[PDB]
Amino acid sequence: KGEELFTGVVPILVELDGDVNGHKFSVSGEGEGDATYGKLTLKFISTTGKLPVPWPTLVTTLVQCFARYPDHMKRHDFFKSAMPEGYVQERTIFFKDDGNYKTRAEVKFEGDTLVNRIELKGIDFKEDGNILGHKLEYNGGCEDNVYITADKQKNGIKANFKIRHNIEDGGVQLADHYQQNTPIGDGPVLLPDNHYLSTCSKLSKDPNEKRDHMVFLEFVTAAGI
C-alpha cells in the first residue's frame, strides 16, 4: 500500500525548470512532509538569480500526496495509492487578464525521498502586469479548496480551483487552476469520489539566505465526504 510510505516524516526534493515569456529560470527545493498532519515544510531557492515571476505564483506548482486524508476518506486518496511509482501532475494556470502557466511534473519516490520534478512554460504575460511587474503581496493569498474528481478514462483524477493573489496596490489577481493527475505505473490506484482538499500556507524568508528564495509552510487536509 502506497499509504504506508507516508506513515512518518518523508524527505522531499523539488526541481523546477521554468520558462516565462522565453526567460529561463530554475528553482531547487527541499524539506519534509508529514501526511499524518498534512504538514509540509519546504525551502525553495532560485539557482538562476532573481525570479522573473513572484514566488506566490509558483506555490501550487512547487506534492498533494502529503495531504491528510481522515480515516473515513482513505479510500479516496489517489495520490498515495500511485506511490512509489508516482504520478504525472499537469496543470494549466490562467492568470486573468494576463498569461498562463502550463506545467508538467512527475511526483514519485527516488529512494526514501519524495521528488517533484517540474517543467513550467509561461506565455502571454504582460510586462506591465501584476506577475512580470512583481505587484503581488508575498503570502499564500486566498486559497480556494482543491476540488477533486475521478477520471476513470485516464485511471487518474482531475482538479479545479482558483487562487486569488492580493495585489500590493489593492485588488486581487485570479489564477484559475486546471489540473490532471495520472499514475506513472500500471499498478492499481484509488479513483476517488468527489471531494476537496483544504489548504493554508505561510510564506516567509530566511534571514541567512542570499539568493531569491521562499520558506514555505503548508497544511493540506481532505474533506467533503
What is the terminal-to-terminal distance?
22 Å
What's the helix count? 1
CATH architecture: Beta Barrel
What about the largest sheet? 11 strands, mixed, barrel
Q: Indicate the structural class.
A: mainly beta
Query: Into which percentage range does the β-strand content fall?
Result: over 45%
PDB class: fluorescent protein
Keywords: fluorescence lifetime, thiol-disulfide redox, fluorescent protein
Assembly: monomeric
Entry title: Reduced state of a turn-off thiol-disulfide redox biosensor with a fluorescence-lifetime readout
Features:
225 residues; 51% strand; 12 strands; Green Fluorescent Protein; 2% helix
Brief rundown of the structure:
With 225 residues, the protein is mainly β. The protein is built from one helix and twelve strands; from the N terminus they run βββαβββββββββ. The chain has an eleven-stranded mixed β-barrel with strand order 1-2-3-12-11-8-9-10-4-5-6.
What secondary-structure arrangement, pairings included, does this model have?
Layout: E1 9-20, E2 23-34, E3 39-46, H1 78-81, E4 87-95, E5 100-110, E6 113-123, E7 142-143, E8 146-151, E9 156-166, E10 172-183, E11 195-204, E12 213-223
Parallel strand pairs: 1-6
Antiparallel strand pairs: 1-2, 2-3, 3-12, 4-5, 4-10, 5-6, 7-9, 8-9, 8-11, 9-10, 11-12
How would you sum up this structure, described in words?
The chain has one helix at 78-81; strands at 9-20, 23-34, 39-46, 87-95, 100-110, 113-123, 142-143, 146-151, 156-166, 172-183, 195-204, 213-223. With 225 residues, it is mainly beta. The protein has one domain (2-223): Green fluorescent protein (Green Fluorescent Protein). It is globular and about 45 Å long.
